[PDB]
RNA sequence: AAUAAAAUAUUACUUUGGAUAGUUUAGUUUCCUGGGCGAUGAAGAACGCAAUGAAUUGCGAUAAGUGAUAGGAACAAUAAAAUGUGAAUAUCCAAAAUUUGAAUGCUUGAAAGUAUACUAAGGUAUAUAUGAUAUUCAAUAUCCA
RNA sequence: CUGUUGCUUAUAGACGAUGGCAUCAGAAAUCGGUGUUGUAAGCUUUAGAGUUUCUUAAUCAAUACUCUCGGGUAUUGAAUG
RNA sequence: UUUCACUCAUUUCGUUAAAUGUUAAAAAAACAUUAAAAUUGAAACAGGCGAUUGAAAGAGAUAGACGGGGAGUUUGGCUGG
RNA sequence: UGAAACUGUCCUUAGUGCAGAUCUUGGUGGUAGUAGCAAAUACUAAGAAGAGGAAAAAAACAUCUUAGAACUGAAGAGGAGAAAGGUUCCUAAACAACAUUACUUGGAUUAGGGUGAAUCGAUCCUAAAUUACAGAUGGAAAUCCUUAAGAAAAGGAUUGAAAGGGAAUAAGAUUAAUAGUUCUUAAUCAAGAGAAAUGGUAACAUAUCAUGAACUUUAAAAUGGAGUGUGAAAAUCUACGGAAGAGUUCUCUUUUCUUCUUAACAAAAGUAAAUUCCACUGAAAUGAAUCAAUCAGAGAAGUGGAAUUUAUUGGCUUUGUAAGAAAUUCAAUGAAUUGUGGUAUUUUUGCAGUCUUCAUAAAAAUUAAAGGGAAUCUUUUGCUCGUACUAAUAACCGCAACAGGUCUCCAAGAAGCAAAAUCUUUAGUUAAAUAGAAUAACGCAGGUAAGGGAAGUCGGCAACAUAGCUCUGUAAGUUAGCAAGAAAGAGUAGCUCUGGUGAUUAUCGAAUCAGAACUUUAAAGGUUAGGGGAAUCCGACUGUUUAAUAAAAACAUAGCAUUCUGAUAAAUCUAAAAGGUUCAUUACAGAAUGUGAUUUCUGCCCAGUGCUCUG
RNA sequence: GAUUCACGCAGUGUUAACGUGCAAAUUACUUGUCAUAUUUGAGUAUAGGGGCGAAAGACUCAUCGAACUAUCUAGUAGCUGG
């Protein structure tokens, strides 16, 4: 048959990011030593809304501590953030919301957020409006400390990964139940394209696996294997159940 | 077009140039057959394609 | 009005009119016809009277 | 309407002049000439195009040089 | 009704290709070009357009004289007078208490 | 029963058409000799040049032709001028050879342009990879005061 | 004799045909008869709900009265002269 | 052979490769640069730019499974059609 | 007839014999002087030019001028551009061919002429994107990378917009044709040449003034949409006073119509609207204000000031330019005039707040200011390229002078809610595949009809009927929002009057509403202008769909549900790849699916085939 | 992502006109729709077992249940015509 509508989405046709109108980058400052021995002071400039995301970008401007300028960045607000407000990013800084501090010296039970992966990496778990990772337990034995995901995983991280203390800004955004279709298009307007889906049964047995004969149904079980190659892996995948949980 | 580069608008000009008769003397040459130019075209009969 | 080559710009035209005809030039317009050739509008200065080189170059 | 009506917007060049070939063959979004087969150091020629080659090949033009080499 | 025609080869309601329509001896209507609407400075810190500074365009600031360019005053085109008076007791206030509070306590 | 307007048939002449016959400055095949392009800018493309040229032919701002050497009295549709103190015509020679094109200072869409150095305008050189030589440098890479 | 032709011909008619008259021919007005509609335009015309300006006379006014059984049309496929 | 420890190939990263290692000595939306003074002021060295993974994972060869996502092809004959 | 080659016999050789192949190519008949030359309301008289209206009406006659009658109706059949065309533009000679007759006409033949820029655009910058040296990959062609890999490029290369950004020009006149381009007059811009200021309490202000390097920052260029209010200009309409010309006039009409204008760039007599700040003062008995809002002890209201915006200086009147131009008349080049207003409509251009987003609605070239304190008026020049014309019921794309298609700017009167239908003024045109006579059938387009009223038919298909505005009145059902313009009834004309709604301090002004006598042909209906009700099925809705026989119950949709994935991942493109997409992303996320709003509810089954297992 | 009219646009019906047409899909009336899931110009990106698809096997230059063009190719034909 055809090439399904999964298998041209990776090939960087129409289906690219509509980022144009976007800020940039979302991160945390390169690590230096101010950072690693010292603490640096930022100012909340301005709270701006990036199209395409949920929640609000500060732009926080620091000052360059080994040569003349302004270091101007652009973190993900945490809730609470205020224009005007200062900001302290290093290992000695205080443990209040909006600082930037290292995973190991958070207490245990610590709410962070824009954690970092790996160390220096500017931040990577828990970005989406509302979102928060927690703190379990430290261990300085190996210089590791416990966290929890969002999506409730438990990941072990270098006690030196850096993270915000709070709660990312934007929260509750998905409870609002978008009422027309007219509203889910300019939901995708800083985004790719994907929205309008055709069901695989209304499509012909050319263009999807599912496409149907006189009655509209399926035929096989949706549920597929790892290892089934791009063009037939449509449905559920791995699925270790399937109905209704209860 | 009003607005057009300087080499096409020389291309236009030839194209002008290229299109006119035999002259009445050539005409009158000994063994002489090209009485009527066939590469001849206008305006609103073949477009040039240029 | 003259004709002259294409490769030649307002400045050249200008100093080639004085040159020629020894003369002085105010104000040069080109345009360049169809066929190839550039028309130049050469106005001399209001102490030079173009009637006389007109009969001189042979216009008259 | 896949006809007559259709055809009433095309006024929009897809090839223009080329610079080495000389035929109306530059394809202006391509950014290459389908003829000649411009950009390309080599000229565009195939071994099915038989015909196309005697169009445009060596003596089918001046041989301005050529042919006082050949000759001596 | 005297109707008129573009002057320039441009035949779009473009934002450049505003024009407006003057009368002219004999009742004959002529088509101006017409300037596009500017913004002033603005604070900054506070964001608030700039007073006593024209909203021209940004090349026309050079051929204004040296004193319609700009206010006299600290920082004097870039700062309302609010901006500045905080500026100036910042400076002051603090620096009074990092001496009092560390520097012989 | 009658008419020959139409209709039909034969021959002569004329007409529309270009078959047939006569003919060939064109092709096809085989064989012999060579198989002689280009950064010293090729093949190709574009533009321009004749006293009257649109195509074609030849040519390149020295333009349907210049010099030289052979050559011996023409060309012609119409005029002119030149011409045995040398017209036509011929050429592996000399000078000259516009814009591009491998295209090569940078840019090129149908783009008009433009930077530096040397000898205002003109003309040269400056792409990429690469061999030898010369010169200036970089790295404690190995020693080393 | 017959046909064409004329009456922008009819008792006929797609075109032919057919029928009638062709200088006592024909055609046209006007004119009377016969029909249709509904009472023309004018005015110093008498009713006019009211209004205005003079100072009580003008003027404005849908409609309405007399002249007016008016005016207009009437073969074009109507009938006389 | 399995379990360990390291990094040195290898992977994944980050910056203007901007203090690595070891010795030594939350009141304030403001400013901070082209140094005085006597080579210091502004300490030294490592043969590691800083982390991460690490002899495992990737790409190669051979072998087993799976693989209509895809390629090639076939789907006998008689016959009151 | 034809005018230069050819023939008979014997062997040899072959591109060697045609009625067919829907045979190939070329030519030609009957049909046949037949079908047609019928959308876009329409032409007529006199004259001129011409071979080209003659004639027993041969009933028609192309072009040009005048007169009559007309159409497009100012979202045009008007005046101009982008693309596309390419000389079709203007003029002259000429009509063999072409524009379904003809043509003296032509976008057709022939020969000439025509496109003038320091200020308009291209050129300059960057957007989506595009392409190089070196590097990486590939058997190869070539691919990837676009600043990451580089001894390359203070920081990152090329291209990419005649609608985005952008230094600077206008009025009149002129040509057979070009004009923000020529001429006259009047301007502007860029690049050049000849121990460092005052004033104001403050907001802030000063014909250059009044020094201001490296380095850093800020702002501009540079930012959605809707709706309401309002400032100013123009057009239309109108009030007062006129000057000039024109039309009507045996019936009147102090009458009806036209003209009465002004540029770029600058000046500052006079005088506005809105917003934001500054000084004095300190609000409660709370005040201030808008159509709406909205605001105040982080300071209202008041009084006095400062600033910015309002199509160039500084918004409007006014002034210079500048009346010497231009318009309307008059005389035969020369003469006359060129006031002041509107609590009216529309358009344009700004301003102020309000609403809305799971939408927040570009960058650079380029410019200015600031922090810091290093150092000690005249004149010249402004190069290259485009510029003619159509822009469409005849110049573009559809084989064409094709009823199809193709992006824009300017935009008068009547009437009306209306840029609707209908008529007209400025401008354009009367020709746009030929006409004349007769007035048969059958047609295409528009109509009417006695009595009955769907009996016709698969089926009220087609047509008929209702139709504006005001007042009264309005059910079942319902997601409580709707149904609803439900249904249903009444009124409406002309003329003469009456009253309500304001501003300035008696004068002035606006269309809107209500009411009363009288008259008649008894009044929305010229044009424009809903048929209504009772139920059943499907889809919840707005939306999309088989270009050219299916517009729907099909697709989408919001809502509901399920699966995988912690990013070195999931899905997935590539032959390969420091390769690519979601991802400028990070579980409120990314990817893969089914059902299709809301309400109510989703029962039992793990045997079979799938999927999975922490085994 | 309320109801309607207009400039426009589409194509519900007449299964009207035309059907060797004005037109290789158009005309007239009727109907619907006529700004936010709106209409539209230019630039730009996606290309053949590929693209694009609010999904009709629809569209990809009058060509689509696999475009156009050239070579293999005078493809093979137990079948039809000469």
């Given at each position: 048959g055809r090439r399904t509508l999964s298998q041209r989405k990776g090939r960087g046709s129409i289906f690219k990011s509509r980022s144009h109108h976007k800020l940039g980058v979302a991160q945390h400052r390169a690590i230096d030593f101010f950072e690693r021995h010292s603490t640096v002071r930022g100012l909340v400039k301005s709270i701006e809304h990036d199209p395409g995301r949920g929640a609000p970008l500060a732009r926080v401007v620091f000052r360059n501590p080994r040569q003349y300028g302004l270091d101007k960045e652009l973190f993900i607000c945490a809730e609470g953030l205020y224009s005007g407000?200062?900001?302290?990013?290093?290992?000695?800084?205080?443990?209040?919301?909006?600082?930037?501090?290292?995973?190991?010296?958070?207490?245990?039970?610590?709410?962070?957020?824009?954690?970092?992966?790996?160390?220096?990496?500017?931040?990577?778990?828990?970005?989406?409006?509302?979102?928060?990772?927690?703190?379990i337990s430290h261990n300085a034995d190996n210089e590791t400390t416990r966290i929890r995901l969002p999506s409730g995983a438990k990941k072990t991280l270098k006690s030196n990964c850096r993270a915000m203390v709070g709660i990312i800004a934007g929260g509750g955004r998905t409870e609002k139940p978008i009422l027309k279709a007219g509203v889910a298009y300019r939901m995708y307007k800083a985004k790719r394209t994907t929205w309008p889906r055709v069901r695989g049964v209304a499509m012909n047995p050319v263009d999807h696996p599912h496409?149907?004969?006189?009655?509209?149904?399926?035929?096989?079980?949706?549920?597929?294997?790892?290892?089934?190659?791009?063009?037939?892996?449509?449905?559920?995948?791995?699925?270790?159940?399937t109905g209704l949980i209860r | 077009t009003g607005?057009?580069?300087?080499?096409?608008?020389?291309?236009?000009?030839?194209?002008?140039?290229?299109?006119?008769?035999?002259?009445?003397?050539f005409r009158m040459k000994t063994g002489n057959t090209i009485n009527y130019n066939f590469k001849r075209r206008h305006w609103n009969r073949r477009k040039m394609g240029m | 009005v003259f004709l002259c080559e294409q490769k030649a710009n307002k400045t050249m035209i200008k100093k080639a009119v004085e040159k020629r005809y020894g003369v002085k030039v105010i104000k040069v317009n080109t345009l360049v016809r169809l066929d190839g050739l550039k028309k130049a509008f050469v106005r001399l200065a209001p102490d030079v009277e173009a009637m006389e080189v007109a009969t001189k170059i042979g216009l008259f | 309407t896949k006809g007559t009506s259709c055809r009433g917007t095309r006024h929009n060049k897809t090839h223009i002049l080329c610079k080495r070939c000389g035929k109306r063959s530059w394809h202006l979004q391509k950014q290459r000439c389908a003829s000649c087969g411009?950009?390309?150091?080599?000229?565009?020629?195939?071994?099915?195009?038989?015909?196309?080659?005697?169009?445009?090949?060596?003596?089918?033009?001046?041989?301005?040089?050529?042919?006082?080499?050949?000759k001596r | 009704?005297?109707?008129?025609?573009?002057?320039?080869?441009?035949?779009?309601?473009?934002?450049?290709?505003g024009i407006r329509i003057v009368k002219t001896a004999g009742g004959n209507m002529?088509?101006?070009?017409?300037?596009?609407?500017?913004?002033?400075?603005?604070?900054?810190?506070?964001?608030?357009?700039?007073?006593?500074?024209?909203?021209?365009?940004?090349?026309?600031?050079?051929?204004?004289?040296?004193?319609?360019?700009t206010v006299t005053r600290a920082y004097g085109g870039v700062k309302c007078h609010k901006c500045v008076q905080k500026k100036i007791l910042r400076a002051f206030l603090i620096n009074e208490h990092n001496?009092?509070?560390?520097?012989?306590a």
């Open positions: 407000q200062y900001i302290y990013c290093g290992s000695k800084a205080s443990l209040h919301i909006g600082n930037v501090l290292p995973i190991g010296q958070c207490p245990e039970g610590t709410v962070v957020c824009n954690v970092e992966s790996k160390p220096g990496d500017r931040g990577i778990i828990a970005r989406a409006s509302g979102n928060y990772a927690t703190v496409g149907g004969g006189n009655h509209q149904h399926v035929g096989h079980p949706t549920t597929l294997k790892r290892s089934s190659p791009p063009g037939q892996k449509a449905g559920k995948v791995a699925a270790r159940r | 607005h057009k580069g300087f080499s096409y608008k020389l291309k236009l000009g030839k194209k002008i140039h290229q299109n006119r008769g035999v002259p009445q003397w | - | 411009y950009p390309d150091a080599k000229m565009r020629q195939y071994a099915w195009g038989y015909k196309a080659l005697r169009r445009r090949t060596q003596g089918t033009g001046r041989m301005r040089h050529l042919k006082i080499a050949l | 009704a005297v109707r008129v025609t573009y002057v320039r080869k441009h035949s779009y309601n473009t934002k450049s290709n002529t088509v101006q070009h017409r300037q596009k609407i500017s913004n002033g400075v603005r604070c900054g810190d506070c964001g608030c357009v700039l007073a006593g500074i024209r909203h021209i365009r940004p090349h026309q600031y050079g051929w204004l004289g040296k004193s319609k360019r001496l009092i509070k560390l520097a012989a």
